Structure 1
Amino acid sequence: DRVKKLINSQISLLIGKGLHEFDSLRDPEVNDFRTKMRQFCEEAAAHRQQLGWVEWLQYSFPLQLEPSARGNRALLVNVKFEGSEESFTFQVSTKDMPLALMACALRKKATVFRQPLVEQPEEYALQVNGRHEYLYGNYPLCHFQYICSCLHSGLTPHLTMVHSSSILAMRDEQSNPASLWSLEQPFSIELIEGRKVNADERMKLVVQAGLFHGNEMLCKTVSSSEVNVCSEPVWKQRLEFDISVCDLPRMARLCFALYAVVDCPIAWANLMLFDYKDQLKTGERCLYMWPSVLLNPAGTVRGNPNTESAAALVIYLPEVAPHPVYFPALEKILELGRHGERGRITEEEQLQLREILERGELYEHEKDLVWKMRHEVQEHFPEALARLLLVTKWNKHEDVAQMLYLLCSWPELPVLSALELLDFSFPDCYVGSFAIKSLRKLTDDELFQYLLQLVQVLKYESYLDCELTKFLLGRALANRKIGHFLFWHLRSEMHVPSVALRFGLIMEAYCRGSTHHMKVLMKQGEALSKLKALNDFVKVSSQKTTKPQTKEMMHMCMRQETYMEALSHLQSPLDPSTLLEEVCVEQCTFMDSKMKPLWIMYSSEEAGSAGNVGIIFKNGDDLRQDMLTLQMIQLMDVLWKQEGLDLRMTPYGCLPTGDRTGLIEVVLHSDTIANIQLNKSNMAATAAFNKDALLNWLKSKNPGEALDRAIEEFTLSCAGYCVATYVLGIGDRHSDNIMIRESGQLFHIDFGHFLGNRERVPFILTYDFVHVIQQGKTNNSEKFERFRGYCERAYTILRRHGLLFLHLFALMRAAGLPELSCSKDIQYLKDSLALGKTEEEALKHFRVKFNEALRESWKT
């Protein structure tokens, strides 16, 4: 129909790639992915359109609960009914549930409307005014993030009673429209020739080839003969490997590196030896190579799409049999693996085995004992699966069969264990499928917390149709907030050729599953397009005229009908719960830094004061490492809160949306330490001593009794950020990248560098901040040591979750961030968390680094 053609054009525009481009590849793997995932996502959409009204609230407006709630005090609340300007202000308890609040609003409505009411509180949900956020379910009001925030800020919760018929009307409005093992011969290939090779004519060309299973070599690497540098080198030679065809594991990858020698790296290319349908590849392959910025096994197994300029390697995969050869089916593997010798060992060896499995590099004899005792591992140490997988001989099909027999009856593992198993160190497809099965129990909150890392893991996948893609799509189609961030994490990397195909296909499938959300996301893309054009203008103008001039010109551009329409009434890409209603042009500006980022302000009558929100649009900087740093800080805040420690952190939004483009959430009523320390005259904060400036500023924002709370907020957040910057090795910290809220809360901005990047970043204590902590007194050991206590408690909590941080950072290596590209970068985190030590030893070490920081602070 004409509606299908329109939806196809809308998807093409949204994802940034024409769908016709998928068809043009004439790739059966692409075609099957598109068909199967379209069916899967359309089935999820059919299920969603018939959800009950409360299930539909769970889909569109998933609950935002405090970390303590997951798994007393008087409170004033303002409640109105939908489409009525009239509101009721009443007193409830923080311990009361939404149902009691709703029953109270209904009794009030019945008295005011003089009618014995027809409505039960069970037919309603409470919307947060002017936000895509609702309060519902059997949780006390203090457990909702919105109420918890209102309590901390002192503000009165403003809620709207929304009836079930109104929620159903939303559901309806948003509907989609109407045998290998016999082949003993060594594996070999013919290296035919190269095309479009660029190198120094004085040198020679060589092709290094290796067979890998993840990062691990399946045998020794082999090199071609050296042939003189030219545009079309010709080898026409056989490269034989030290591994039988029968012993190639299912996920074996053949990896190449073309280089020049008198070493000068030129290009690299990888390919899976078996296709997506489990068939062993035969015949000619033209491999369009990727430039080398020598073998790169973690590199993509798809060819470079720039076939016009890429160097190409032509190879021949020999016909090993007169008929096609497929990897054996699971039943054949299980039959082979079912047979073995069950380990019988001494009581002393059982103690030595327990010692190593509970301990991750091992010696050869330690690996032999783990393998020998693999049945004992399964039955009594199931969480040591990763250790057993690492000792398995992936180059011996009998050993692999025996490992897979145990894997297929392995008990499900905790979420923490499964995150480790997604690492590229575990490349087998059954292992990958096992990890996904153990991750199905992830709550939507945990999935959201690790979504960024799960998206990065897609870059290690060998095939398009995989369990991780299906998992992410199914969870995204069942939770609109997950769907929102899955979309943006994929869309923001469409300018990266190695992932544009895979990411483009996932975004298309998602859109098939929610036509309405596709349109919501298109409205966000239109605002982003306008912001880029506006920012390009500001960049040009800022070099030619004065700031008030560029600001008025920026304002005139925004007041154009096309800009006013595109920039208004959208869901925020930083947070789909936040609605960006009317752009407040008068309040919009830009910042003086290099990229001239735009500062965009919004207001919303319906949301009142909560509708006053800002976004910063920045183009020219890669925001991926900032987002990762902020998400790690937010995880620290969750882990602390789960132990009842609230360090008053400010986990503001940061989201890459495109090529060196993204948004940052504005924290209103905040200023940089630098601006406050300028100590300007005729201000409430003006000081006799520069050290008095920050405290005088806090006193001016918090007069009388409020000062004590502000100093406390400052102290707790200082402790949180001191521990966060030390653990993450956040460097380049000065007064212009540290901010303070009027509440007293300190937070960090502009996370350009982390993990010591290479130098070990020491713990930092600044004397201007010690002065505030000590309430302006020269000596105040009571307050200072209380602050040290918060630091120690925060640090010991993080250490206890050390493995989670390590597993997440390990998955992030797939992102290709320059400061997270090797083992040295992660060693930084291993050292800061001192995980190879006892808690008493690590606390002793932290105390040494803290005291060293105090003595450095005392020099000021």
Structure 2
Amino acid sequence: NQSVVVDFLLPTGVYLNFPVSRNANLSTIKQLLWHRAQYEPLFHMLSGPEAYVFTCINQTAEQQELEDEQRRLCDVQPFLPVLRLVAREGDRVKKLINSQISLLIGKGLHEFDSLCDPEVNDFRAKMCQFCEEAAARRQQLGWEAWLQYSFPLQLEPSLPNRALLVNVKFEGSEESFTFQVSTKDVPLALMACALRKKATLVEQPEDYTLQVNGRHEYLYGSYPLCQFQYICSCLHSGLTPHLTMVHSSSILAMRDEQSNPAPLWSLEQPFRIELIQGSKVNADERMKLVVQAGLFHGNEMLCKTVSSSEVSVCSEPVWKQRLEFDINICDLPRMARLCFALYAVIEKDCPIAWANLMLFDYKDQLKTGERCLYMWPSVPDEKGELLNPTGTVRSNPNTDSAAALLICLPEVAPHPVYYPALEKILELGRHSECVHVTEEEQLQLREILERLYEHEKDLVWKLRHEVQEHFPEALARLLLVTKWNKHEDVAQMLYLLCSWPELPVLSALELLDFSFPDCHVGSFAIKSLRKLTDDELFQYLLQLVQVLKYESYLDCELTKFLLDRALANRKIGHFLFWHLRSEMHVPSVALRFGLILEAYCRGSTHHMKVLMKQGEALSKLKALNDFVKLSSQKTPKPQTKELMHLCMRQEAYLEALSHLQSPLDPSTLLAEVCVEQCTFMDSKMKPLWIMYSNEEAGSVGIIFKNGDDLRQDMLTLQMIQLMDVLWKQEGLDLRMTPYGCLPTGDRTGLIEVVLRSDTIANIQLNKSNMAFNKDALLNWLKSKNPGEALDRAIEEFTLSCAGYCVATYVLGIGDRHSDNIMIRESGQLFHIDFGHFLGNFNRERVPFILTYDFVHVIQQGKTNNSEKFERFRGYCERAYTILRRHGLLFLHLFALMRAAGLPELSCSKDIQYLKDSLALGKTEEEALKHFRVKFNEALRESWKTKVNWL
């Protein structure tokens, strides 16, 4: 039905109950309420409607003062239809933010309070303050600085010196000035020239900036016109640029829309623990339960893994055993990690669950007393380890129904004990430096460090002073040879780390991996990542986000670093937000990711408004896709398409989907839905195809896909993008189309629509013989590129095919076929739907693949055109060579993605795939002669595939 019965609670105590329309805005409901209240008792005691604000309990179980009364009750979406009138005033700014954060981040802010955890309370206190400061500090500074934050420049990785005309206009005025300008002109030159056209006095050029009208992409700074993506895109296509001059004041109008709110080693007895009781264990009664425990630091064991006795299976098994480990209390490193696994065993091996605990807390204190560890279920995999030390440290959120081992860390001393401070570490670490002047071991270490085994480790440890001196890049090699189960060694290695020279970004990425848990290591890594430019940081933001999953404590350097950068650059904030938001459904990260999103939001109230509009658009798309999914099972597609529109016509649906910045690119503007062009694709999950339009620009499209997982397709597209940058940085544009792919939620996301494209299978389907049928792709490019433009179109195809051939080989992406490879009208081959990679699907190496159909187009229809075909061979060879030069970057990045828990990227073999495909074990000459053999054999195979095709 349309109308809802709503409960109204008046501040006189009076209660009033009557139906109102779901679509009615809160201001309309308040009118209806006042009209009805007249005829109920104590009306004359009430103040005016404006004196009060509705309150309600929202979907996240929190009271919300509903300040914006231009909102429909169906969009407010209270838990029960119950509205309470309360006094308006009482710092309404902080109240309103706290409410919007809860709905935006998914989790309710009260769920942090409920935990009664100091670590959470200190994080929130420290980080929310830090973010509130930066945002306040941002609002103070100039419009240029603010423009840089809000709309950072989109440059190419960067010769032509050409001349081409450009349309320019001013804000408000309809008429436009087209005038000539060369490629290598700084933006001021265009602005000053555009002001002469205005005059031929009034204004000056340095109180202005050029907006690429249609979108939020601004043109400024010392860089020339040719390095901007828009102009570069306009020059390559041939189309004329279209800009708008905008005043400094008009930019301060955006800045001041809304304001941010105002402001010991004396304990030599062995480590031991009391295992008390299990709870809520589900297992087979014939078996008997065991609990295996072990201390860890990173991936390596600190000591032998002692176990329990076999107690009988039940819900509430009781051990009451002291477990003593072969390591002292004084030896434990800062990130020592006690790790449990409850097993079910035949008496005479089933892993039930597991749980890890940090022996020291977030305040550097050694934890004592009882702990109720709520456990995570064990999932079986190829390498079935006893314990799972790489697993998370925060407990299972499901305390209602989950299992739990009850244990008790004993009191070691009367007063509490901490891990020593950095001063006492450098005290012990500095001393015991010895054994200089050793010539024989300089050859031995160099031999070792130009490629670990136990013989080799002790040599590296002895010559640690010389490693710092001569082999600085081999820090990670040294960190692993360090024996973390002895506190003497740990002091000596940390002493060197404080003095260790700043490593390059590449080296510092390796140091973020799970093998290097120490706080001093991660701190050193970030210190080296702090020189990343925003462009380069963006290229790795996915990987840095995943690495948070194996951080020990909430407040860490990496988090502070990410928030630092997000507050300085709004685009980095945007993508940090969705990377976190799309994993808030995952119990193991919900708290960590929850608290960070709160911090970001408090320092990004501007963008917080934009992300709300996006969240609600995505909210409606789920509802729309779910109706389509259900309708497809019932009726035919044609009628479902018309029925989809009828839902899209509605007040709530049309306005929510209309007028919002794209999640895939917040500079891109989605304005008017083209409901005529809206549809859904034929695919298991039936993803929605939403087309937009813009009178300012210009026709953008998106795909809302819900049900399948997009994380792997994002990673793959991130890598093809990264490749494209690396290739562009060596002056090779291979015309790639790394379309945007963004996971927004639980098996939910957006995919960029590449305009003016179709699948190879569909292009070939027009000219069918039914058992020549070839030249279908080539015929198609004639119609979309007539006369002289075909030569360009063939070049776009050759260049693009080369990059996508190498890309798909290197990343190990199989299942490539006609109906998942696409051409553009420009003539650019590009690939879609990278469901599988690194050889997976069964697990064999994906060979290099040339298709005949594509070679035929490359050769311009001729059977033999070796001049043109050699060019293509060179494009492939040059491409592959460049990726090898940055092989370690790919390996390190993929090594961090192991955190993400993707099936196809889960282990060393999956990384080894990249090693072998890039031939990183071989020399550059040897690598490249192997690539030719692959190429040649793909060329021989190309014929044999299409001769079999009927």
TM range (shorter): over 0.9
Q: CA deviation at 1:177?
A: 4.3
Q: Which residue of 178, 185, 191 corresponds with 1:89?
A: 178
**Aligned partners of 1:598 and 1:51: how far apart in 2?**
43
Q: CA deviation at 1:655?
A: 0.3
**Aligned partners of 1:810 and 1:157: how far apart in 2?**
42
Q: CA deviation at 1:210?
A: 1.1
**Aligned partners of 1:39 and 1:6: how far apart in 2?**
17
Q: CA deviation at 1:584?
A: 0.9
Q: Deviations over 1:313-348 (max 9, x none)?
A: 011101111111100011000100011233424433
Q: Which residue of 542, 559, 564 corresponds with 1:474?
A: 564
Which moves more between the two structures, 166-175 or 456-465?
Answer: 166-175
8 Å CA contact 2:373, 2:395 repeated in 1: yes
8 Å CA contact 1:616, 1:664 repeated in 2: yes
Q: Deviations over 1:599-636 (max 9, x none)?
A: 00111111146xxx000000001100000000000000
**Aligned partners of 2:434 and 2:582: how far apart in 1?**
51
TM-score, normalising length from structure 1?
A: 0.96
8 Å CA contact 2:273, 2:324 repeated in 1: yes
1:114 equivalent in structure 2: none
Matched, 1:142 2:226: yes
TM-score, normalising length from structure 2?
A: 0.87
**Aligned partners of 2:256 and 2:93: how far apart in 1?**
18
8 Å CA contact 1:205, 1:228 repeated in 2: yes
Q: CA deviation at 1:417?
A: 0.8
Which moves more between the two structures, 631-640 or 212-221?
Answer: 212-221
Q: CA deviation at 1:134?
A: 0.6
Q: CA deviation at 1:214?
A: 0.9
1:179–1:131 Cα change, 3 Å: closer
- Secondary structure in 2 matching 1:275: coil
**Aligned partners of 2:868 and 2:944: how far apart in 1?**
20
**Aligned partners of 2:925 and 2:779: how far apart in 1?**
40
8 Å CA contact 2:809, 2:847 repeated in 1: yes
8 Å CA contact 1:179, 1:325 repeated in 2: no
Q: CA deviation at 1:47?
A: 1.3
1:349–1:590 Cα change, 3 Å: same
1:641–1:277 Cα change, 3 Å: same
8 Å CA contact 1:180, 1:245 repeated in 2: no
Which moves more between the two structures, 343-352 or 296-305?
Answer: 343-352
**Aligned partners of 2:720 and 2:307: how far apart in 1?**
46
Q: CA deviation at 1:151?
A: 1.3
Q: CA deviation at 1:457?
A: 0.7
8 Å CA contact 2:767, 2:776 repeated in 1: no
Which moves more between the two structures, 474-483 or 199-208?
Answer: 199-208
Q: Deviations over 1:633-660 (max 9, x none)?
A: 0000000011001100001100000000
8 Å CA contact 1:209, 1:222 repeated in 2: yes
Q: CA deviation at 1:370?
A: 1.2
Query: Which segments of 5 or more consecutive residues in structure 1 lack a partner in the other structure?
Result: 112-116
Q: Deviations over 1:660-696 (max 9, x none)?
A: 000000000010011001125899xxxx922210011
Which moves more between the two structures, 640-649 or 174-183?
Answer: 174-183
- Secondary structure in 2 matching 1:271: strand
2:590 equivalent in structure 1: 500
8 Å CA contact 1:393, 1:400 repeated in 2: yes
Q: CA deviation at 1:139?
A: 1.1
Q: Deviations over 1:438-472 (max 9, x none)?
A: 11111001111100000001100100011111110
Q: Deviations over 1:393-436 (max 9, x none)?
A: 11111111000111011111111111110011111000011111
**Aligned partners of 1:391 and 1:405: how far apart in 2?**
15
Q: Deviations over 1:185-234 (max 9, x none)?
A: 11111111111111111111111111111111111111111222111111
- Secondary structure in 2 matching 1:690: coil
- Secondary structure in 1 matching 2:634: coil
**Aligned partners of 1:351 and 1:119: how far apart in 2?**
70
**Aligned partners of 1:345 and 1:727: how far apart in 2?**
46
Alignment coverage as a number of residue pairs = 843
**Aligned partners of 2:589 and 2:416: how far apart in 1?**
30
8 Å CA contact 2:375, 2:395 repeated in 1: yes
When Rg is computed on C-alpha atoms for both structures, the one with the higher figure is: 2
8 Å CA contact 2:94, 2:261 repeated in 1: no
Q: CA deviation at 1:118?
A: 2.6
- Secondary structure in 2 matching 1:542: helix
Q: CA deviation at 1:841?
A: 1.1
Q: CA deviation at 1:75?
A: 1.5
8 Å CA contact 2:425, 2:494 repeated in 1: yes
8 Å CA contact 2:805, 2:876 repeated in 1: yes
**Aligned partners of 1:559 and 1:354: how far apart in 2?**
71
**Aligned partners of 2:438 and 2:509: how far apart in 1?**
34
**Aligned partners of 2:859 and 2:749: how far apart in 1?**
39
- Secondary structure in 1 matching 2:146: helix
**Aligned partners of 1:513 and 1:779: how far apart in 2?**
62
**Aligned partners of 1:682 and 1:125: how far apart in 2?**
57
Matched, 1:591 2:676: no
Q: Deviations over 1:226-255 (max 9, x none)?
A: 222111111111111111110100001111
- Secondary structure in 2 matching 1:344: coil
Q: CA deviation at 1:171?
A: 1.4
8 Å CA contact 2:734, 2:802 repeated in 1: yes
Q: CA deviation at 1:357?
A: 2.2
**Aligned partners of 1:224 and 1:848: how far apart in 2?**
58
1:660 equivalent in structure 2: 747
**Aligned partners of 1:752 and 1:697: how far apart in 2?**
28
8 Å CA contact 1:393, 1:399 repeated in 2: yes
Q: Deviations over 1:137-192 (max 9, x none)?
A: 11111101111111122211111111111112211224314593111111111111
Q: CA deviation at 1:811?
A: 0.6
8 Å CA contact 2:767, 2:773 repeated in 1: no
8 Å CA contact 1:195, 1:231 repeated in 2: yes
Q: Percent same amino acid among aligned pairs?
A: 95
**Aligned partners of 1:271 and 1:625: how far apart in 2?**
31
Q: Deviations over 1:50-82 (max 9, x none)?
A: 1221111110110111112xxx21122110111
8 Å CA contact 2:136, 2:262 repeated in 1: no
**Aligned partners of 2:311 and 2:936: how far apart in 1?**
61
Q: Deviations over 1:350-404 (max 9, x none)?
A: 1221232233xx2223211211111111122222111111111111111110001
**Aligned partners of 1:20 and 1:179: how far apart in 2?**
21
8 Å CA contact 2:426, 2:494 repeated in 1: yes
**Aligned partners of 2:749 and 2:926: how far apart in 1?**
42
Query: Which segments of 5 or more consecutive residues in structure 2 lack a partner in the other structure?
Result: 1-90, 380-385, 946-950
Q: CA deviation at 1:781?
A: 1.8
8 Å CA contact 1:342, 1:375 repeated in 2: no
8 Å CA contact 1:691, 1:771 repeated in 2: no
- Secondary structure in 2 matching 1:127: strand
Higher RCO (C-alpha under 8 Å, 6+ residues apart)? 1
**Aligned partners of 1:797 and 1:576: how far apart in 2?**
31
8 Å CA contact 1:343, 1:375 repeated in 2: no
8 Å CA contact 1:535, 1:597 repeated in 2: yes
Matched, 1:274 2:366: no
8 Å CA contact 1:423, 1:811 repeated in 2: yes
1:829 equivalent in structure 2: 914
8 Å CA contact 1:595, 1:618 repeated in 2: yes
Q: Deviations over 1:786-824 (max 9, x none)?
A: 211111110000001000000000110000011111111
